[PDB]
Structures are given as C-alpha cells and as structure tokens.
Design a protein around this ligand. Sequence first.
Ligand SMILES: [Ca+2]
Ligand SMILES: [O]
Ligand SMILES: [O]
Ligand SMILES: [O]
Ligand SMILES: [O]
Ligand SMILES: [O]
Ligand SMILES: [Te]
Length: 279
Amino acid sequence: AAQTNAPWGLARISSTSPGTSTYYYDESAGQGSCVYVIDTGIEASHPEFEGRAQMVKTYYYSSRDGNGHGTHCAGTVGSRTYGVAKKTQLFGVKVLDDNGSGQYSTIIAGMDFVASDKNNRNCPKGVVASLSLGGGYSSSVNSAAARLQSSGVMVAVAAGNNNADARNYSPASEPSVCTVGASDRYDRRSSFSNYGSVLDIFGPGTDILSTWIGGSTRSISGTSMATPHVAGLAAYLMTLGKTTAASACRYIADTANKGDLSNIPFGTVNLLAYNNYQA
Ligand SMILES: [Ca+2]
Ligand SMILES: [O]
Ligand SMILES: [O]
Ligand SMILES: [O]
Ligand SMILES: [O]
Ligand SMILES: [O]
Ligand SMILES: [Te]
C-alpha cells in the first residue's frame, strides 16, 4: 500500500533514504494487534481513529485527554492518516493528568494494569505498550517496565528530551525494554534527544504531524513522538508474523537503517527504525 503526501516520519520509516513523502506498508496494517498508549488519554472520538481507539483505564476524574499529548502519540501509532499501524486496536491508559504530570506510583500501577488487562482483550497478533513519558532514575519504575515486557508486551519507551545520557532517566534506562531516541527529517539526531548505550533505536521525533484534541491536528517534537513510531512498527511487524513481543526490539534493531544518522555521540547506536517493506 502507498499513502501519498504522508507525514515525513511515516515516509522515513519505509525508506532507505531521507527526503521522500510516500509511506509504503503491507495492507495488513497491524490488524489483530493491540497497542496500549500509557499517557494523558486518547480522544477516541477523533474521526482519525475510526472506532479503533478506546479508553480502558484512568486514575483521575475523567478518562478524557484534556492535554492532547496522548492523543498525538496514539495518532502516530494507529490513526488512519498519521499512523504507522493503521488497523491496530488502540487502548488508552491515563496515568498522566491534563497538565502532563503523573506520580511514579500511578505510572507503575498503569504498567501492571496493562500486563493484566491484555488478558481481557483480543490481540491474536500480539500486544505493544507505548510509554512517551519519563523522569529521574527509579529502580521501581524500571522494574515495572521490565515486568510488563516479561509478561509478553513489546514495551517501547521514550529516551527523554534532555540532550543527555538516558542512563539517568526512567523507564528509559531499563535495559529490557525498547528505548527510543529521536531524529529529524534530515537524518540528524534531534537537538533534544537523549543518547547513550541504553538506546536501542531512533525514530522520527522532530516536527511530527498527528492528531490532537478537539478533533484537530498539530505538529510537535520529542522522543515522545519517536516512541509511537517504534510501537506502531512493532505492532505492524507482529501482525506480519515477522517477530514477537519478546524479540521485536532486537528485530527492529537488526533490520534498521544503519549508520545514516548524524550527530550520534560515540557509543550510541546509529540505527533508524525501518519497516523493510518491499512491494
Ligand atoms: Ca533495551
Ligand atoms: O514525554
Ligand atoms: O518529553
Ligand atoms: O517528548
Ligand atoms: O513529550
Ligand atoms: O518524552
Ligand atoms: Te516527551
């Protein structure tokens, strides 16, 4: 399948070169997979989600996304226009309030919620969780992310936007999950992207167009935007039967575009997420 005039990041993940504008992907499109977006919520009524999104949990007075961030990330996973995996099922877990903030205890509860809740969902092709959030190093946050991964969920987490080593942030620093840095449309490391040995992969993160609340769209930047590209890619590859939740991060690294990014510090992987789709 070909989507013309796609957002640059979608075009990038199906290309061996920067500078193109068509997204190419297998029409299976993540059907039969599930992606949990653990964030500020998802505006499931957005026409871009086509009835494939729903809220499954909140820790606050509403399950509504009163911020937009979670809706944007969900859109990059699985919206019809802005998404990588255009037929996946999207499940929202609101661990962040409408200001984008959340206690680590709530975030941990949300991760253990997903590990159990997947047993209440139909995801025959597999389960992914996208965590576009983080704070300072916490062994308990890392352990929760490790449990979620161990339970059979492909966990993708943001590296963080500190232009620093991700070793000092959580859940970025948990080795067993898929830690995602950000790149721009010219194949530069995004100015704000964290780096370091713990990164597994980069995805598009600067100037990413996606869904927003009030049935709208906008472009924003972050490792938060790179993460759902990788989560969606995992769901897509799992639907194709090419990899599994336990092995998808490694598979994505194996099959990445290699050595093509600039301003990657010595000791950080130079790997850009790539679907290797050939018509
Ligand atoms: Ca890892
Ligand atoms: O974030
Ligand atoms: O962020
Ligand atoms: O972000
Ligand atoms: O973010
Ligand atoms: O982030
Ligand atoms: Te972020």
